[PDB]
Amino acid sequence: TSGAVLQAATGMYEQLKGEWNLSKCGEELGRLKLVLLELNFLPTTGTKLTKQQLILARDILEIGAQWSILRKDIPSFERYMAQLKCYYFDYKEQLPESAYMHQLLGLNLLFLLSQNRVAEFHTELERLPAKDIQTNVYIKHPVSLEQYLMEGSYNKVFLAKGNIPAESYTFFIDILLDTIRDEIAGCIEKAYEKILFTEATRILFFNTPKKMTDYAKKRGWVLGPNNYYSFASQQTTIPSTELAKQVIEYARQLEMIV
Amino acid sequence: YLASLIRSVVALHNLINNKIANRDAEKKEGQ
């Protein structure tokens, strides 16, 4: 029973590898998920499988993540990455080292950058080994990108597009571009009284000038393109009721018998 | 604020005296 199912799972895994190493992937991955559910994803402290087929389960989950990113399907990427993080971090001792791991860890870090979840990004970094952040390239590149972004060298983070350790770090750079433009827009929001169109185009990297209205058609801080755009100028009364509330509270605390 | 601070300090002194008195009474009862 168990061994035969394991052999069948291995066979269908190798069939998937031969297939791609799109749709056919999709349904093959679904079938693999069902088969592994007849098996167990996580031994969860008391089954103690120690399976080369558990290593294989991790592998098929990885190929699922790659297929998801190839499809540009963020929710599927999130699901696969959550489960892959579980596999990577939980059973470190029993499982052997996965050489094809740091690429995906850095991919998830870059995705976190793109989604602008800096807190989760830094928690993931803290989970990661300290040495790897410097020794490796796959993790170091997202780390360097976040370092540039949080230092404020937007030109540097843009220039760092080229150095992609692997092709997988693609379209996450584009979501990161969108996030970078949003952050620049936030800087223009909280600062830069009275900004102009040409300098805004130069700084907040828009598309072709004929599309320069972008982010004014969507973010639209009631810009009012008064030639200069005026930044729409975006940015004395006694709160007697609140103050009376506070003073009555003082009187209450003074007059209560306790 | 000054008034309330003074009042709180006085109340703390009163409770210090009460704790000391309770300590003395229980020690005397035990002995």
Partner: protein, 294 residues
Amino acid sequence: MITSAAGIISLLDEDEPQLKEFALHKLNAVVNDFWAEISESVDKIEVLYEDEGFRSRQFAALVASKVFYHLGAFEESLNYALGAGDLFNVNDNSEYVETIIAKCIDHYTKQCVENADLPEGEKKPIDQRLEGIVNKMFQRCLDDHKYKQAIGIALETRRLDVFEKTILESNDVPGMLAYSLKLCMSLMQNKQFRNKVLRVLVKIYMNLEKPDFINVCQCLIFLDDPQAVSDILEKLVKEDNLLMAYQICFDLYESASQQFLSSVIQNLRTPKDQTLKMIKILSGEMAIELHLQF
């Protein structure tokens, strides 16, 4: 170990009602530790419960009740524990089970006390599964050879049928009756409920193999039922038992008021020497004469 349930919670989001249930099973297995993470994702379990389910409608209820219990919202935990149905498994030494049992008992007692005073028909319905949990607790206490204090739970819940059943189908019926009468006279306040409990007590007394006529007359004095005490005396004198009636009438004079005594005397009026001297006892001629002589 596992160190993170995020993958298990993520399994739920899928559209496969075969993956979802395994996710729920692992999630329940690990809710002992990862309620913190699962709480933010509870809403997904909420919607999953709110559908056909395919064993999701069963297990998601228990999972959500467990996570809400861990979180602290017992009011919302109770609803989902009830919705679980047969998966609660009252019979197990689990702290979650014990706490939800306590909360359900408190909720039932509150509901019964609240709705009892309302009209006969104007009663807000109870949940049948909640009633079933309460009755399962009643039956477990009975099976534990712990007959006592099941009477107390019944008294708090204001349901008599269980009170009667547990106080009858139990050992030391005299002792349990004495305990019940002590409770009924001393602690409980609601007069209508006290009268109902005393009616049950007198019914049990009379249906006993050897009726305790003195306690019956005490309860009847409390109930203010001169017709019933008169009928009891009539039966007691028709059957050859005179010392019972003598002491019954003495206690009736010593406890009941003048109006009650007059009413019972009138009922008796409605050998004859026995009846005449019963009337004399109830009027109290001999009681006062004996006290003066003493």
